[PDB]
Amino acid sequence: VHHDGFQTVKATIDWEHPMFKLYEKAKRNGKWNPADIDFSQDQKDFASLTSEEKISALPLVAGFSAGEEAVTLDILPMAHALARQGRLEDVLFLTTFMHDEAKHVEMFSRWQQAVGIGQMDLSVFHNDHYKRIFYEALPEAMNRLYADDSPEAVIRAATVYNMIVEGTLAESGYYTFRQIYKKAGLFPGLLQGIDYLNMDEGRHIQFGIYTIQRIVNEDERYYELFIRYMDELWPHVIGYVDYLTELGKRQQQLARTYALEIDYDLLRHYVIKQFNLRKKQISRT
Amino acid sequence: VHHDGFQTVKATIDWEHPMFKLYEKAKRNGKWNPADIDFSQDQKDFASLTSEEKISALPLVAGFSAGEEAVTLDILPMAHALARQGRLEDVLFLTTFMHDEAKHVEMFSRWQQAVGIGQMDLSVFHNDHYKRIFYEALPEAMNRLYADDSPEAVIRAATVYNMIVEGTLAESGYYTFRQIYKKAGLFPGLLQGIDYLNMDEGRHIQFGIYTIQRIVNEDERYYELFIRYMDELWPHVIGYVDYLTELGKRQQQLARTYALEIDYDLLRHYVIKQFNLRKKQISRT
Ligand SMILES: CCCCCCCCCCCCCCCC(=O)O
Ligand SMILES: CCCCCCCCCCCCCCCC(=O)O
Ligand SMILES: [Fe+3]
Ligand SMILES: [Fe+3]
Ligand SMILES: [Mn+3]
Ligand SMILES: [Mn+3]
Numbered sequence: 001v002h003h004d005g006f007q008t009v010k011a012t013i014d015w016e017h018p019m020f021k022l023y024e025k026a027k028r029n030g031k032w033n034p035a036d037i038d039f040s041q042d043q044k045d046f047a048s049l050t051s052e053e054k055i056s057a058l059p060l061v062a063g064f065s066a067g068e069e070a071v072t073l074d075i076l077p078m079a080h081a082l083a084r085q086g087r088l089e090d091v092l093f094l095t096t097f098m099h100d101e102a103k104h105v106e107m108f109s110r111w112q113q114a115v116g117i118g119q120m121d122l123s124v125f126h127n128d129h130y131k132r133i134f135y136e137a138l139p140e141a142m143n144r145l146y147a148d149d150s151p152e153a154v155i156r157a158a159t160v161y162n163m164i165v166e167g168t169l170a171e172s173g174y175y176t177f178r179q180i181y182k183k184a185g186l187f188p189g190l191l192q193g194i195d196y197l198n199m200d201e202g203r204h205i206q207f208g209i210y211t212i213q214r215i216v217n218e219d220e221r222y223y224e225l226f227i228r229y230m231d232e233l234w235p236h237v238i239g240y241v242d243y244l245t246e247l248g249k250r251q252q253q254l255a256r257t258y259a260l261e262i263d264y265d266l267l268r269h270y271v272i273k274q275f276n277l278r279k280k281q282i283s284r285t
Numbered sequence: 286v287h288h289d290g291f292q293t294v295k296a297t298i299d300w301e302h303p304m305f306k307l308y309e310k311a312k313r314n315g316k317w318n319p320a321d322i323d324f325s326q327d328q329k330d331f332a333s334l335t336s337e338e339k340i341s342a343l344p345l346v347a348g349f350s351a352g353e354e355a356v357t358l359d360i361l362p363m364a365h366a367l368a369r370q371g372r373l374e375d376v377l378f379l380t381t382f383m384h385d386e387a388k389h390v391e392m393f394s395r396w397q398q399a400v401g402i403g404q405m406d407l408s409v410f411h412n413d414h415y416k417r418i419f420y421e422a423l424p425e426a427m428n429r430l431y432a433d434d435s436p437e438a439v440i441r442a443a444t445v446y447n448m449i450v451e452g453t454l455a456e457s458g459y460y461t462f463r464q465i466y467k468k469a470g471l472f473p474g475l476l477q478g479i480d481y482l483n484m485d486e487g488r489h490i491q492f493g494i495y496t497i498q499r500i501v502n503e504d505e506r507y508y509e510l511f512i513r514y515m516d517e518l519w520p521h522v523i524g525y526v527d528y529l530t531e532l533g534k535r536q537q538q539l540a541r542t543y544a545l546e547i548d549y550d551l552l553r554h555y556v557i558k559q560f561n562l563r564k565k566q567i568s569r570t
Contacts, residue, residue, distance in 0.1 A: 027320070
């Protein structure tokens with residue numbers, strides 16, 4: 001559809017817009033380059049592992065690898081919908097979001113190549129619950145925005161992408177990674193990438209909060225919609241978490257070798273903690 | 286539509302793909318930040334000008350300011366269409382393309398604010414020909430890809446965006462800027478931004494060449510389509526160039542003040558030169 005004007009010809013940018021401030025922060029804090037990470041020690045660590053120690057780590061790399069690729073493809077509709085609404089600053093920020101997710105896909109792929117599991121097909125570690133989030137509810141809530149950019153539709157998209165997938169599952173997976181391999185001294189390069197990802201993630205979640213909150217503020221009925229959609233997806237969050245935990249408990253050889261006290265009951269409380277505190281970053285008024 | 290698999294879970298990235306190599310170059314060469322540019326001298330230069338010297342420069346800032354905002358919004362469909370075709374490396378590169386265009390909009394807007402013409406409405410300097418490219422043919426060729434991603438549709442989009450708007454008009458405008466203000470010693474910050482833009486542009490054009498060429502290679506009938514669409518748009522290219530030139534010739538006070546020998550006949554041969562050499566970077570086989 002035609003352009004009926006431009007905002008930097010009639011006016012300029014709203015330099016005070018929060019998303020323009022988040023865009024500035026993204027440029028300042030987002031220079032990291034996955035190609036600069038040294039994985040030579042990760043290749044050694046992975047080689048050194050038993051075959052059952054090798055398996056131990058893969059499920060979590062599987063969920064992250066697919067999940068990074070999901071959001072890289074699935075954030076595009078949000079940028080379309082905000083663009084077409086004239087939210088120039090949001091769009092400017094989303095170009096950093098999309099580039100972040102591209103580096104995230106690059107990072108996990110370079111690790112896989114480095115430790116020798118590139119060809120390996122990690123799809124096996126996506127159970128039914130994971131697919132229901134990432135293969136289904138995520139792409140549907142985002143793609144919807146190409147035809148339906150109502151406040152409800154925008155809230156549901158930010159809830160699934162930013163509050164659940166990033167704000168709940170990715171946050172908990174970063175924690176999990178540290179709680180396990182930071183303790184073992186394993187996979188230094190991967191953990192360097194995880195810290196980089198975690199930092200980017202903070203801005204991803206902050207776009208979600210601002211997007212959800214700016215719609216709640218127009219009509220508090222949408223607060224209810226937000227809590228509802230969060231609760232709708234919790235079964236699949238926790239059923240993927242339960243499944244990964246069951247995998248962890250029958251794969252105990254890396255825990256023993258490295259004297260890791262893998263407290264799965266605690267990881268599970270972190271997930272529950274993340275989910276509830278995302279709810280609490282949305283105010284009903 | 287559901288995700289039916291992921292390329293960094295079954296395999297990895299194609300590290301040898303040209304667009305993955307262009308993506309790597311973009312990250313290496315694309316760290317510049319418009320917020321780091323010092324425009325304090327540009328504010329002085331613009332203040333120092335007569336009112337008729339002030340007008341002299343604005344038409345070209347008008348076309349660039351709107352034009353940067355056009356491609357920032359209008360490149361999204363290309364990334365959608367390539368994403369949905371599974372061209373992961375192309376998408377990775379396009380995240381840098383879209384972020385480049387965001388910085389380009391930021392750059393021109395920060396200059397406008399710096400020299401005091403933010404509120405000023407530069408739409409007046411878009412004649413009928415400019416609007417036919419930027420207000421019409423560009424958004425239509427890109428938006429089409431949301432429903433029609435045929436090789437014809439993809440060629441036409443890359444031809445209008447990358448070969449004409451960037452490869453012909455933006456290239457010639459960078460030249461023009463140097464031929465005029467590099468000579469005067471004016472607007473150092475703006476010219477620093479133009480060199481940054483010009484460098485980004487090289488990758489933008491190279492994605493267009495690769496996109497057009499990889500489709501020609503499947504069926505040489507599309508070479509004809511490429512030449513045809515290039516020729517279809519030339520009238521509007523040159524009619525905007527003629528209009529800017531007519532503006533320049535009745536606004537001769539900055540030329541005289543600064544002893545600039547503004548050879549408009551030469552700018553016009555540069556445009557013609559750019560257009561023909563874009564045609565020559567597409568091979569018929
Ligand atoms: C054993 C404890 C389980 C903890 C939960 C781990 C979840 C693994 C990560 C999967 C989701 C990754 C989504 C990435 C989001 C993004 O890159 O923006
Ligand atoms: C007087 C000589 C005229 C020379 C032609 C000048 C054209 C001005 C620039 C307008 C198009 C800018 C498009 C930007 C493309 C991009 O940012 O990718
Ligand atoms: Fe994210
Ligand atoms: Fe460009
Ligand atoms: Mn990510
Ligand atoms: Mn540009």
